[PDB]
PDB file of C-alpha atoms and ligand atoms in Angstrom:
ATOM      1  CA  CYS A   1      27.689  42.822-114.283  1.00  0.00           C
ATOM      2  CA  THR A   2      30.545  40.250-114.496  1.00  0.00           C
ATOM      3  CA  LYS A   3      33.571  41.039-112.371  1.00  0.00           C
ATOM      4  CA  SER A   4      36.075  41.342-115.119  1.00  0.00           C
ATOM      5  CA  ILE A   5      38.087  44.324-116.254  1.00  0.00           C
ATOM      6  CA  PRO A   6      36.072  45.659-118.006  1.00  0.00           C
ATOM      7  CA  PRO A   7      32.575  44.345-116.802  1.00  0.00           C
ATOM      8  CA  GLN A   8      30.095  42.830-119.099  1.00  0.00           C
ATOM      9  CA  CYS A   9      26.324  42.807-118.618  1.00  0.00           C
TER      10      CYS A   9
ATOM     11  CA  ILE F   1      37.848  42.632-103.204  1.00  0.00           C
ATOM     12  CA  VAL F   2      35.759  45.150-101.290  1.00  0.00           C
ATOM     13  CA  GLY F   3      35.986  45.001 -97.540  1.00  0.00           C
ATOM     14  CA  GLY F   4      38.787  42.458 -97.379  1.00  0.00           C
ATOM     15  CA  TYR F   5      42.271  42.299 -96.061  1.00  0.00           C
ATOM     16  CA  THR F   6      45.834  42.225 -97.439  1.00  0.00           C
ATOM     17  CA  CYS F   7      46.504  38.407 -97.729  1.00  0.00           C
ATOM     18  CA  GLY F   8      50.292  38.520 -97.238  1.00  0.00           C
ATOM     19  CA  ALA F   9      52.869  37.755 -99.933  1.00  0.00           C
ATOM     20  CA  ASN F  10      52.249  34.254-101.512  1.00  0.00           C
ATOM     21  CA  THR F  11      49.814  33.182 -98.845  1.00  0.00           C
ATOM     22  CA  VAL F  12      47.441  32.029-101.587  1.00  0.00           C
ATOM     23  CA  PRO F  13      49.859  30.138-103.811  1.00  0.00           C
ATOM     24  CA  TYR F  14      47.099  28.873-106.212  1.00  0.00           C
ATOM     25  CA  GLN F  15      46.037  32.497-107.132  1.00  0.00           C
ATOM     26  CA  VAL F  16      47.205  33.662-110.510  1.00  0.00           C
ATOM     27  CA  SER F  17      46.696  36.878-112.464  1.00  0.00           C
ATOM     28  CA  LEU F  18      45.645  36.844-116.089  1.00  0.00           C
ATOM     29  CA  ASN F  19      47.501  39.795-117.788  1.00  0.00           C
ATOM     30  CA  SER F  20      47.106  41.545-121.113  1.00  0.00           C
ATOM     31  CA  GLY F  21      49.393  44.566-120.313  1.00  0.00           C
ATOM     32  CA  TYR F  22      47.247  44.888-117.204  1.00  0.00           C
ATOM     33  CA  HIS F  23      45.538  42.681-114.856  1.00  0.00           C
ATOM     34  CA  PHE F  24      42.031  41.794-115.969  1.00  0.00           C
ATOM     35  CA  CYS F  25      40.916  38.590-114.271  1.00  0.00           C
ATOM     36  CA  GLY F  26      42.108  35.950-111.774  1.00  0.00           C
ATOM     37  CA  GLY F  27      42.421  32.250-111.908  1.00  0.00           C
ATOM     38  CA  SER F  28      43.426  29.196-109.848  1.00  0.00           C
ATOM     39  CA  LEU F  29      46.214  26.723-110.522  1.00  0.00           C
ATOM     40  CA  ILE F  30      44.884  23.189-110.362  1.00  0.00           C
ATOM     41  CA  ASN F  31      48.028  21.510-111.735  1.00  0.00           C
ATOM     42  CA  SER F  32      51.464  22.513-113.103  1.00  0.00           C
ATOM     43  CA  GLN F  33      50.045  23.199-116.541  1.00  0.00           C
ATOM     44  CA  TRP F  34      46.319  24.140-116.115  1.00  0.00           C
ATOM     45  CA  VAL F  35      44.453  27.073-114.602  1.00  0.00           C
ATOM     46  CA  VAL F  36      40.641  27.340-113.858  1.00  0.00           C
ATOM     47  CA  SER F  37      39.110  30.680-114.631  1.00  0.00           C
ATOM     48  CA  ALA F  38      35.783  32.180-115.764  1.00  0.00           C
ATOM     49  CA  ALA F  39      34.536  31.730-119.305  1.00  0.00           C
ATOM     50  CA  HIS F  40      33.732  35.453-119.540  1.00  0.00           C
ATOM     51  CA  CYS F  41      37.466  36.176-118.924  1.00  0.00           C
ATOM     52  CA  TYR F  42      38.315  34.694-122.385  1.00  0.00           C
ATOM     53  CA  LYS F  43      40.542  36.594-124.565  1.00  0.00           C
ATOM     54  CA  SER F  44      43.453  36.166-126.834  1.00  0.00           C
ATOM     55  CA  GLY F  45      47.041  37.132-125.749  1.00  0.00           C
ATOM     56  CA  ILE F  46      46.777  36.041-122.146  1.00  0.00           C
ATOM     57  CA  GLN F  47      49.935  35.879-120.018  1.00  0.00           C
ATOM     58  CA  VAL F  48      49.432  33.946-116.816  1.00  0.00           C
ATOM     59  CA  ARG F  49      51.346  35.482-113.888  1.00  0.00           C
ATOM     60  CA  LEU F  50      52.088  33.057-110.984  1.00  0.00           C
ATOM     61  CA  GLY F  51      53.791  33.590-107.671  1.00  0.00           C
ATOM     62  CA  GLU F  52      52.493  37.227-107.571  1.00  0.00           C
ATOM     63  CA  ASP F  53      51.807  39.526-104.687  1.00  0.00           C
ATOM     64  CA  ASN F  54      52.469  43.065-105.850  1.00  0.00           C
ATOM     65  CA  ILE F  55      51.496  42.843-109.504  1.00  0.00           C
ATOM     66  CA  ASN F  56      53.266  45.999-110.331  1.00  0.00           C
ATOM     67  CA  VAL F  57      56.645  45.244-108.735  1.00  0.00           C
ATOM     68  CA  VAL F  58      59.093  42.424-109.514  1.00  0.00           C
ATOM     69  CA  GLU F  59      59.536  40.769-106.027  1.00  0.00           C
ATOM     70  CA  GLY F  60      61.505  37.739-107.057  1.00  0.00           C
ATOM     71  CA  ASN F  61      58.977  34.767-107.014  1.00  0.00           C
ATOM     72  CA  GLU F  62      57.060  35.451-110.143  1.00  0.00           C
ATOM     73  CA  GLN F  63      56.620  33.113-113.029  1.00  0.00           C
ATOM     74  CA  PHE F  64      55.242  34.694-116.290  1.00  0.00           C
ATOM     75  CA  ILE F  65      53.864  31.888-118.634  1.00  0.00           C
ATOM     76  CA  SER F  66      51.895  32.516-121.830  1.00  0.00           C
ATOM     77  CA  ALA F  67      48.533  30.827-122.270  1.00  0.00           C
ATOM     78  CA  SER F  68      48.709  28.199-125.093  1.00  0.00           C
ATOM     79  CA  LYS F  69      45.057  27.039-124.983  1.00  0.00           C
ATOM     80  CA  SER F  70      41.861  28.508-123.587  1.00  0.00           C
ATOM     81  CA  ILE F  71      38.935  26.053-123.294  1.00  0.00           C
ATOM     82  CA  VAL F  72      35.511  27.576-122.450  1.00  0.00           C
ATOM     83  CA  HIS F  73      32.717  25.195-121.262  1.00  0.00           C
ATOM     84  CA  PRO F  74      31.057  23.797-124.442  1.00  0.00           C
ATOM     85  CA  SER F  75      27.628  25.108-122.968  1.00  0.00           C
ATOM     86  CA  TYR F  76      28.771  28.477-121.814  1.00  0.00           C
ATOM     87  CA  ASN F  77      26.071  31.088-122.272  1.00  0.00           C
ATOM     88  CA  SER F  78      27.223  34.702-122.108  1.00  0.00           C
ATOM     89  CA  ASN F  79      23.738  36.013-121.649  1.00  0.00           C
ATOM     90  CA  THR F  80      22.843  33.985-118.645  1.00  0.00           C
ATOM     91  CA  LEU F  81      26.448  33.277-117.558  1.00  0.00           C
ATOM     92  CA  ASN F  82      25.382  29.701-117.046  1.00  0.00           C
ATOM     93  CA  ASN F  83      28.562  27.395-117.184  1.00  0.00           C
ATOM     94  CA  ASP F  84      30.854  30.285-116.598  1.00  0.00           C
ATOM     95  CA  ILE F  85      34.103  28.269-116.416  1.00  0.00           C
ATOM     96  CA  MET F  86      37.131  28.118-118.580  1.00  0.00           C
ATOM     97  CA  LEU F  87      40.428  26.087-118.468  1.00  0.00           C
ATOM     98  CA  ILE F  88      43.738  27.679-119.559  1.00  0.00           C
ATOM     99  CA  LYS F  89      46.700  25.578-120.542  1.00  0.00           C
ATOM    100  CA  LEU F  90      50.079  27.019-119.885  1.00  0.00           C
ATOM    101  CA  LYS F  91      52.679  27.105-122.750  1.00  0.00           C
ATOM    102  CA  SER F  92      55.112  25.512-120.336  1.00  0.00           C
ATOM    103  CA  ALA F  93      54.587  23.795-117.024  1.00  0.00           C
ATOM    104  CA  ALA F  94      54.921  26.072-113.983  1.00  0.00           C
ATOM    105  CA  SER F  95      57.703  25.238-111.481  1.00  0.00           C
ATOM    106  CA  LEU F  96      55.947  24.179-108.310  1.00  0.00           C
ATOM    107  CA  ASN F  97      57.259  25.485-105.043  1.00  0.00           C
ATOM    108  CA  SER F  98      55.995  26.771-101.834  1.00  0.00           C
ATOM    109  CA  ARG F  99      54.694  30.060-103.519  1.00  0.00           C
ATOM    110  CA  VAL F 100      53.287  28.446-106.663  1.00  0.00           C
ATOM    111  CA  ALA F 101      50.990  25.479-105.931  1.00  0.00           C
ATOM    112  CA  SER F 102      47.709  23.993-106.830  1.00  0.00           C
ATOM    113  CA  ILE F 103      44.330  23.845-105.168  1.00  0.00           C
ATOM    114  CA  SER F 104      42.245  20.673-104.830  1.00  0.00           C
ATOM    115  CA  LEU F 105      39.115  20.136-106.785  1.00  0.00           C
ATOM    116  CA  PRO F 106      36.104  19.352-104.783  1.00  0.00           C
ATOM    117  CA  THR F 107      34.998  15.736-104.194  1.00  0.00           C
ATOM    118  CA  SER F 108      31.453  16.922-103.042  1.00  0.00           C
ATOM    119  CA  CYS F 109      29.503  20.317-103.062  1.00  0.00           C
ATOM    120  CA  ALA F 110      29.760  22.703-100.164  1.00  0.00           C
ATOM    121  CA  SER F 111      26.826  23.438 -97.876  1.00  0.00           C
ATOM    122  CA  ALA F 112      25.323  26.833 -96.966  1.00  0.00           C
ATOM    123  CA  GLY F 113      27.210  28.657 -94.269  1.00  0.00           C
ATOM    124  CA  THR F 114      30.601  27.125 -95.050  1.00  0.00           C
ATOM    125  CA  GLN F 115      33.229  29.701 -94.732  1.00  0.00           C
ATOM    126  CA  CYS F 116      35.367  30.227 -97.846  1.00  0.00           C
ATOM    127  CA  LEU F 117      38.478  32.426 -98.820  1.00  0.00           C
ATOM    128  CA  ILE F 118      37.800  34.648-101.844  1.00  0.00           C
ATOM    129  CA  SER F 119      40.921  36.476-103.187  1.00  0.00           C
ATOM    130  CA  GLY F 120      42.040  38.754-106.089  1.00  0.00           C
ATOM    131  CA  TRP F 121      43.331  42.047-107.295  1.00  0.00           C
ATOM    132  CA  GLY F 122      40.018  43.546-108.249  1.00  0.00           C
ATOM    133  CA  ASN F 123      38.461  47.003-107.283  1.00  0.00           C
ATOM    134  CA  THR F 124      38.470  47.592-103.410  1.00  0.00           C
ATOM    135  CA  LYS F 125      35.706  50.232-103.633  1.00  0.00           C
ATOM    136  CA  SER F 126      31.891  49.698-103.790  1.00  0.00           C
ATOM    137  CA  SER F 127      31.569  53.160-105.301  1.00  0.00           C
ATOM    138  CA  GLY F 128      34.304  54.337-107.758  1.00  0.00           C
ATOM    139  CA  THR F 129      37.493  52.526-108.496  1.00  0.00           C
ATOM    140  CA  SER F 130      40.734  51.695-106.558  1.00  0.00           C
ATOM    141  CA  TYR F 131      42.962  48.849-107.722  1.00  0.00           C
ATOM    142  CA  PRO F 132      45.374  47.357-105.129  1.00  0.00           C
ATOM    143  CA  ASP F 133      49.009  46.464-105.910  1.00  0.00           C
ATOM    144  CA  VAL F 134      48.938  43.450-103.564  1.00  0.00           C
ATOM    145  CA  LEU F 135      46.573  40.520-103.345  1.00  0.00           C
ATOM    146  CA  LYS F 136      43.418  41.037-101.241  1.00  0.00           C
ATOM    147  CA  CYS F 137      41.536  38.375 -99.286  1.00  0.00           C
ATOM    148  CA  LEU F 138      37.979  37.960 -98.044  1.00  0.00           C
ATOM    149  CA  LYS F 139      36.407  35.275 -95.775  1.00  0.00           C
ATOM    150  CA  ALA F 140      32.852  34.831 -96.754  1.00  0.00           C
ATOM    151  CA  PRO F 141      30.042  32.251 -96.185  1.00  0.00           C
ATOM    152  CA  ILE F 142      28.156  30.465 -98.921  1.00  0.00           C
ATOM    153  CA  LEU F 143      24.469  31.627 -98.936  1.00  0.00           C
ATOM    154  CA  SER F 144      21.464  29.364 -98.992  1.00  0.00           C
ATOM    155  CA  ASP F 145      19.988  28.880-102.503  1.00  0.00           C
ATOM    156  CA  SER F 146      16.682  30.509-101.399  1.00  0.00           C
ATOM    157  CA  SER F 147      18.352  33.654-100.312  1.00  0.00           C
ATOM    158  CA  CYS F 148      20.491  33.657-103.565  1.00  0.00           C
ATOM    159  CA  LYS F 149      17.400  33.357-105.669  1.00  0.00           C
ATOM    160  CA  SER F 150      15.530  35.949-103.746  1.00  0.00           C
ATOM    161  CA  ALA F 151      18.416  38.443-104.306  1.00  0.00           C
ATOM    162  CA  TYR F 152      18.379  37.606-108.021  1.00  0.00           C
ATOM    163  CA  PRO F 153      15.048  36.399-109.116  1.00  0.00           C
ATOM    164  CA  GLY F 154      15.164  34.450-112.292  1.00  0.00           C
ATOM    165  CA  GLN F 155      18.889  34.532-112.700  1.00  0.00           C
ATOM    166  CA  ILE F 156      20.413  31.797-110.444  1.00  0.00           C
ATOM    167  CA  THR F 157      20.970  28.446-112.144  1.00  0.00           C
ATOM    168  CA  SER F 158      22.030  25.168-110.679  1.00  0.00           C
ATOM    169  CA  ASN F 159      25.511  25.936-111.589  1.00  0.00           C
ATOM    170  CA  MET F 160      25.666  29.072-109.427  1.00  0.00           C
ATOM    171  CA  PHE F 161      25.767  29.934-105.780  1.00  0.00           C
ATOM    172  CA  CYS F 162      25.839  33.149-103.799  1.00  0.00           C
ATOM    173  CA  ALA F 163      28.517  33.923-101.201  1.00  0.00           C
ATOM    174  CA  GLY F 164      29.203  36.951 -99.013  1.00  0.00           C
ATOM    175  CA  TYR F 165      27.043  39.324 -96.932  1.00  0.00           C
ATOM    176  CA  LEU F 166      23.582  40.840 -97.491  1.00  0.00           C
ATOM    177  CA  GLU F 167      24.267  43.919 -95.340  1.00  0.00           C
ATOM    178  CA  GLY F 168      26.779  45.197 -97.901  1.00  0.00           C
ATOM    179  CA  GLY F 169      30.397  46.247 -97.606  1.00  0.00           C
ATOM    180  CA  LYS F 170      32.086  42.924 -98.332  1.00  0.00           C
ATOM    181  CA  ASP F 171      32.219  41.390-101.769  1.00  0.00           C
ATOM    182  CA  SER F 172      34.320  40.445-104.811  1.00  0.00           C
ATOM    183  CA  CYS F 173      34.494  43.216-107.533  1.00  0.00           C
ATOM    184  CA  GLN F 174      35.708  44.030-110.964  1.00  0.00           C
ATOM    185  CA  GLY F 175      39.162  42.386-111.537  1.00  0.00           C
ATOM    186  CA  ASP F 176      38.274  39.342-109.213  1.00  0.00           C
ATOM    187  CA  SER F 177      36.506  37.434-112.036  1.00  0.00           C
ATOM    188  CA  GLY F 178      37.888  33.929-112.568  1.00  0.00           C
ATOM    189  CA  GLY F 179      39.597  33.832-109.358  1.00  0.00           C
ATOM    190  CA  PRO F 180      39.018  31.390-106.460  1.00  0.00           C
ATOM    191  CA  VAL F 181      36.454  30.645-103.852  1.00  0.00           C
ATOM    192  CA  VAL F 182      38.094  28.030-101.583  1.00  0.00           C
ATOM    193  CA  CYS F 183      36.407  26.191 -98.760  1.00  0.00           C
ATOM    194  CA  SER F 184      38.130  23.670 -96.654  1.00  0.00           C
ATOM    195  CA  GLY F 185      40.951  23.424 -99.109  1.00  0.00           C
ATOM    196  CA  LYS F 186      38.704  22.828-102.165  1.00  0.00           C
ATOM    197  CA  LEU F 187      38.052  25.096-105.236  1.00  0.00           C
ATOM    198  CA  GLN F 188      34.183  25.362-104.788  1.00  0.00           C
ATOM    199  CA  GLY F 189      33.634  28.622-106.683  1.00  0.00           C
ATOM    200  CA  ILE F 190      34.813  30.882-109.422  1.00  0.00           C
ATOM    201  CA  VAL F 191      34.239  34.561-109.191  1.00  0.00           C
ATOM    202  CA  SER F 192      31.660  35.388-111.819  1.00  0.00           C
ATOM    203  CA  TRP F 193      29.124  38.188-111.353  1.00  0.00           C
ATOM    204  CA  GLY F 194      26.838  40.307-109.349  1.00  0.00           C
ATOM    205  CA  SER F 195      24.842  43.505-109.256  1.00  0.00           C
ATOM    206  CA  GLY F 196      27.423  46.100-108.394  1.00  0.00           C
ATOM    207  CA  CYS F 197      29.870  45.311-105.604  1.00  0.00           C
ATOM    208  CA  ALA F 198      29.245  45.215-101.851  1.00  0.00           C
ATOM    209  CA  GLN F 199      25.685  46.450-102.296  1.00  0.00           C
ATOM    210  CA  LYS F 200      22.996  45.659 -99.766  1.00  0.00           C
ATOM    211  CA  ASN F 201      20.989  42.500-100.707  1.00  0.00           C
ATOM    212  CA  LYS F 202      23.194  41.994-103.717  1.00  0.00           C
ATOM    213  CA  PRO F 203      25.693  39.162-102.792  1.00  0.00           C
ATOM    214  CA  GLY F 204      28.210  37.943-105.197  1.00  0.00           C
ATOM    215  CA  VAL F 205      27.492  35.085-107.628  1.00  0.00           C
ATOM    216  CA  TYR F 206      29.904  32.137-108.333  1.00  0.00           C
ATOM    217  CA  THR F 207      30.266  29.339-110.595  1.00  0.00           C
ATOM    218  CA  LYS F 208      29.555  26.070-108.716  1.00  0.00           C
ATOM    219  CA  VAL F 209      32.736  24.100-109.360  1.00  0.00           C
ATOM    220  CA  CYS F 210      31.591  20.899-107.889  1.00  0.00           C
ATOM    221  CA  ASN F 211      29.307  20.374-110.941  1.00  0.00           C
ATOM    222  CA  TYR F 212      32.320  20.502-113.330  1.00  0.00           C
ATOM    223  CA  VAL F 213      34.901  18.005-111.901  1.00  0.00           C
ATOM    224  CA  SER F 214      34.388  15.430-114.507  1.00  0.00           C
ATOM    225  CA  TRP F 215      34.429  17.889-117.375  1.00  0.00           C
ATOM    226  CA  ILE F 216      37.604  19.519-116.034  1.00  0.00           C
ATOM    227  CA  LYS F 217      39.382  16.202-115.707  1.00  0.00           C
ATOM    228  CA  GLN F 218      38.284  15.045-119.156  1.00  0.00           C
ATOM    229  CA  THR F 219      39.389  18.291-120.832  1.00  0.00           C
ATOM    230  CA  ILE F 220      42.756  18.250-119.188  1.00  0.00           C
ATOM    231  CA  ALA F 221      43.237  14.548-120.343  1.00  0.00           C
ATOM    232  CA  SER F 222      42.351  15.294-123.940  1.00  0.00           C
ATOM    233  CA  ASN F 223      44.298  18.623-124.435  1.00  0.00           C
TER     234      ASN F 223
HETATM  235 CA1   CA Z   1      55.114  41.070-108.782  1.00  0.00          CA
END
Protein backbone atom coordinates (compact mmCIF):
# COMPACT_ATOMS: atom_id res chain seq x y z
CA UNK A 1 0.00 0.00 0.00
CA UNK A 2 2.84 2.38 0.80
CA UNK A 3 4.96 3.45 -2.17
CA UNK A 4 8.26 2.18 -0.79
CA UNK A 5 10.47 -0.63 -2.06
CA UNK A 6 9.06 -2.98 -0.90
CA UNK A 7 5.49 -1.82 -0.29
CA UNK A 8 3.82 -2.20 3.11
CA UNK A 9 0.11 -2.62 3.82
CA ILE B 1 6.11 7.71 -11.31
CA VAL B 2 3.52 6.28 -13.72
CA GLY B 3 2.55 8.45 -16.67
CA GLY B 4 5.22 11.07 -16.00
CA TYR B 5 8.11 12.49 -18.00
CA THR B 6 11.89 12.51 -17.75
CA CYS B 7 12.62 15.55 -15.57
CA GLY B 8 16.04 16.34 -17.01
CA ALA B 9 19.33 16.03 -15.16
CA ASN B 10 19.36 17.96 -11.88
CA THR B 11 16.18 19.91 -12.68
CA VAL B 12 14.79 18.96 -9.23
CA PRO B 13 17.84 19.77 -7.08
CA TYR B 14 16.07 19.09 -3.76
CA GLN B 15 15.20 15.51 -4.76
CA VAL B 16 17.36 12.90 -3.01
CA SER B 17 17.52 9.12 -3.26
CA LEU B 18 17.60 6.94 -0.14
CA ASN B 19 19.90 4.00 -0.88
CA SER B 20 20.61 0.68 0.85
CA GLY B 21 22.45 -1.03 -1.99
CA TYR B 22 19.42 -0.08 -4.13
CA HIS B 23 17.05 2.87 -4.32
CA PHE B 24 14.11 2.30 -1.95
CA CYS B 25 12.61 5.74 -1.17
CA GLY B 26 12.96 9.39 -2.06
CA GLY B 27 13.36 12.48 0.09
CA SER B 28 13.58 16.26 -0.06
CA LEU B 29 16.51 18.40 1.04
CA ILE B 30 15.29 21.22 3.31
CA ASN B 31 18.71 22.47 4.41
CA SER B 32 22.33 21.43 3.99
CA GLN B 33 22.05 18.82 6.79
CA TRP B 34 18.41 17.64 6.82
CA VAL B 35 16.10 15.64 4.55
CA VAL B 36 12.31 15.23 4.78
CA SER B 37 10.98 11.77 3.92
CA ALA B 38 8.20 9.37 4.95
CA ALA B 39 8.15 7.59 8.31
CA HIS B 40 7.42 4.27 6.64
CA CYS B 41 10.74 4.58 4.75
CA TYR B 42 12.62 4.27 8.07
CA LYS B 43 15.46 1.74 8.10
CA SER B 44 19.02 1.51 9.34
CA GLY B 45 22.01 1.85 7.03
CA ILE B 46 20.59 4.64 4.86
CA GLN B 47 22.89 6.42 2.42
CA VAL B 48 21.47 9.68 1.07
CA ARG B 49 22.36 10.31 -2.58
CA LEU B 50 22.14 13.94 -3.67
CA GLY B 51 22.65 15.49 -7.08
CA GLU B 52 21.44 12.32 -8.79
CA ASP B 53 19.88 11.90 -12.18
CA ASN B 54 20.86 8.46 -13.45
CA ILE B 55 21.01 6.54 -10.15
CA ASN B 56 22.95 3.67 -11.77
CA VAL B 57 25.68 5.73 -13.48
CA VAL B 58 28.22 8.10 -11.94
CA GLU B 59 27.67 11.35 -13.86
CA GLY B 60 29.78 13.78 -11.81
CA ASN B 61 27.41 15.81 -9.60
CA GLU B 62 26.54 13.18 -6.99
CA GLN B 63 27.10 13.52 -3.26
CA PHE B 64 26.78 10.33 -1.21
CA ILE B 65 26.31 11.05 2.51
CA SER B 66 25.39 8.54 5.19
CA ALA B 67 22.38 9.24 7.39
CA SER B 68 23.47 9.84 10.99
CA LYS B 69 20.01 10.34 12.51
CA SER B 70 16.49 9.31 11.51
CA ILE B 71 13.58 10.89 13.40
CA VAL B 72 10.06 9.61 12.77
CA HIS B 73 7.16 11.73 13.93
CA PRO B 74 6.46 10.89 17.60
CA SER B 75 2.83 10.01 16.76
CA TYR B 76 3.44 8.09 13.53
CA ASN B 77 1.05 5.16 13.20
CA SER B 78 2.17 2.45 10.78
CA ASN B 79 -1.34 0.96 10.59
CA THR B 80 -3.20 4.15 9.60
CA LEU B 81 -0.10 5.91 8.18
CA ASN B 82 -1.17 9.04 10.06
CA ASN B 83 1.79 11.38 10.62
CA ASP B 84 3.83 9.63 7.92
CA ILE B 85 6.81 11.99 8.08
CA MET B 86 10.46 11.50 8.99
CA LEU B 87 13.54 13.72 9.24
CA ILE B 88 16.97 12.41 8.25
CA LYS B 89 20.15 14.15 9.41
CA LEU B 90 23.18 13.84 7.14
CA LYS B 91 26.45 12.68 8.72
CA SER B 92 28.07 15.72 7.09
CA ALA B 93 26.65 18.85 5.51
CA ALA B 94 25.91 18.65 1.81
CA SER B 95 27.75 21.07 -0.46
CA LEU B 96 25.05 23.37 -1.82
CA ASN B 97 25.25 24.27 -5.51
CA SER B 98 22.96 24.66 -8.51
CA ARG B 99 22.32 20.89 -8.57
CA VAL B 100 22.03 20.30 -4.80
CA ALA B 101 19.64 22.77 -3.15
CA SER B 102 16.83 22.92 -0.63
CA ILE B 103 13.07 23.31 -1.05
CA SER B 104 11.08 25.77 1.05
CA LEU B 105 8.67 24.60 3.71
CA PRO B 106 5.11 25.92 3.36
CA THR B 107 3.83 28.94 5.24
CA SER B 108 0.20 28.00 4.54
CA CYS B 109 -1.62 24.93 3.27
CA ALA B 110 -2.37 24.52 -0.43
CA SER B 111 -5.87 24.57 -1.93
CA ALA B 112 -7.57 21.95 -4.07
CA GLY B 113 -6.69 22.26 -7.74
CA THR B 114 -3.22 23.68 -7.17
CA GLN B 115 -0.79 22.12 -9.64
CA CYS B 116 2.19 20.41 -8.03
CA LEU B 117 5.35 18.64 -9.18
CA ILE B 118 5.81 15.05 -7.98
CA SER B 119 9.11 13.32 -8.69
CA GLY B 120 10.93 10.09 -7.98
CA TRP B 121 12.67 6.95 -9.22
CA GLY B 122 9.75 4.63 -8.55
CA ASN B 123 7.97 2.11 -10.75
CA THR B 124 6.74 3.56 -14.05
CA LYS B 125 4.14 0.83 -14.70
CA SER B 126 0.65 0.55 -13.24
CA SER B 127 0.79 -3.21 -13.89
CA GLY B 128 4.10 -4.98 -13.37
CA THR B 129 7.42 -3.33 -12.61
CA SER B 130 9.84 -1.16 -14.56
CA TYR B 131 12.26 1.02 -12.63
CA PRO B 132 13.83 4.00 -14.40
CA ASP B 133 17.47 4.97 -14.34
CA VAL B 134 16.73 8.71 -14.49
CA LEU B 135 14.43 10.89 -12.42
CA LYS B 136 10.77 11.02 -13.47
CA CYS B 137 8.38 13.94 -13.01
CA LEU B 138 4.62 14.36 -12.86
CA LYS B 139 2.48 17.48 -12.74
CA ALA B 140 -0.62 16.71 -10.71
CA PRO B 141 -3.41 18.66 -8.99
CA ILE B 142 -4.38 18.47 -5.35
CA LEU B 143 -7.83 16.92 -5.09
CA SER B 144 -10.67 18.09 -2.88
CA ASP B 145 -10.89 16.47 0.54
CA SER B 146 -14.39 15.23 -0.32
CA SER B 147 -13.18 13.36 -3.41
CA CYS B 148 -10.18 12.03 -1.49
CA LYS B 149 -12.42 10.62 1.24
CA SER B 150 -14.84 9.18 -1.34
CA ALA B 151 -11.92 7.33 -2.95
CA TYR B 152 -10.69 5.99 0.42
CA PRO B 153 -13.61 5.86 2.87
CA GLY B 154 -12.48 5.86 6.49
CA GLN B 155 -8.76 6.18 5.68
CA ILE B 156 -8.04 9.89 5.05
CA THR B 157 -6.96 11.84 8.13
CA SER B 158 -6.48 15.59 8.50
CA ASN B 159 -2.75 14.96 7.86
CA MET B 160 -3.32 13.53 4.37
CA PHE B 161 -4.42 14.80 1.00
CA CYS B 162 -4.99 13.22 -2.40
CA ALA B 163 -3.33 14.39 -5.60
CA GLY B 164 -3.40 13.13 -9.18
CA TYR B 165 -6.05 11.88 -11.58
CA LEU B 166 -9.21 9.83 -11.04
CA GLU B 167 -9.22 8.54 -14.64
CA GLY B 168 -6.03 6.53 -14.01
CA GLY B 169 -2.69 6.39 -15.77
CA LYS B 170 -0.82 9.09 -13.80
CA ASP B 171 0.41 8.58 -10.24
CA SER B 172 3.32 8.03 -7.91
CA CYS B 173 4.29 4.39 -7.37
CA GLN B 174 6.58 2.07 -5.43
CA GLY B 175 9.96 3.71 -4.95
CA ASP B 176 8.51 7.23 -4.92
CA SER B 177 7.64 7.13 -1.19
CA GLY B 178 9.21 9.89 0.87
CA GLY B 179 9.79 12.13 -2.12
CA PRO B 180 8.38 15.56 -2.82
CA VAL B 181 5.10 17.11 -3.82
CA VAL B 182 6.04 20.72 -4.54
CA CYS B 183 3.45 23.43 -5.24
CA SER B 184 4.44 27.05 -5.92
CA GLY B 185 7.95 26.30 -4.70
CA LYS B 186 6.79 24.83 -1.37
CA LEU B 187 7.03 21.26 -0.10
CA GLN B 188 3.34 20.59 0.51
CA GLY B 189 3.33 16.78 0.31
CA ILE B 190 5.32 13.61 0.89
CA VAL B 191 4.64 10.53 -1.21
CA SER B 192 2.92 8.13 1.20
CA TRP B 193 0.44 5.52 -0.05
CA GLY B 194 -2.42 4.50 -2.30
CA SER B 195 -4.34 1.53 -3.62
CA GLY B 196 -2.10 0.30 -6.40
CA CYS B 197 -0.69 2.85 -8.83
CA ALA B 198 -2.47 4.92 -11.47
CA GLN B 199 -5.70 2.97 -10.93
CA LYS B 200 -9.07 4.50 -11.74
CA ASN B 201 -10.66 6.32 -8.79
CA LYS B 202 -7.62 5.51 -6.60
CA PRO B 203 -5.48 8.67 -6.51
CA GLY B 204 -2.25 8.97 -4.60
CA VAL B 205 -2.32 9.91 -0.92
CA TYR B 206 0.26 12.30 0.49
CA THR B 207 1.38 13.50 3.91
CA LYS B 208 0.14 17.07 4.44
CA VAL B 209 3.43 18.84 5.18
CA CYS B 210 1.86 22.19 6.10
CA ASN B 211 0.69 20.64 9.40
CA TYR B 212 4.25 19.79 10.49
CA VAL B 213 6.30 22.96 9.96
CA SER B 214 6.63 23.74 13.67
CA TRP B 215 7.59 20.15 14.48
CA ILE B 216 10.14 20.10 11.65
CA LYS B 217 11.83 23.27 12.85
CA GLN B 218 11.89 22.21 16.51
CA THR B 219 13.31 18.79 15.64
CA ILE B 220 16.10 20.39 13.58
CA ALA B 221 16.88 22.88 16.35
CA SER B 222 17.19 20.13 18.99
CA ASN B 223 19.13 17.48 17.01
CA1 LIG C 1 24.32 9.02 -10.73
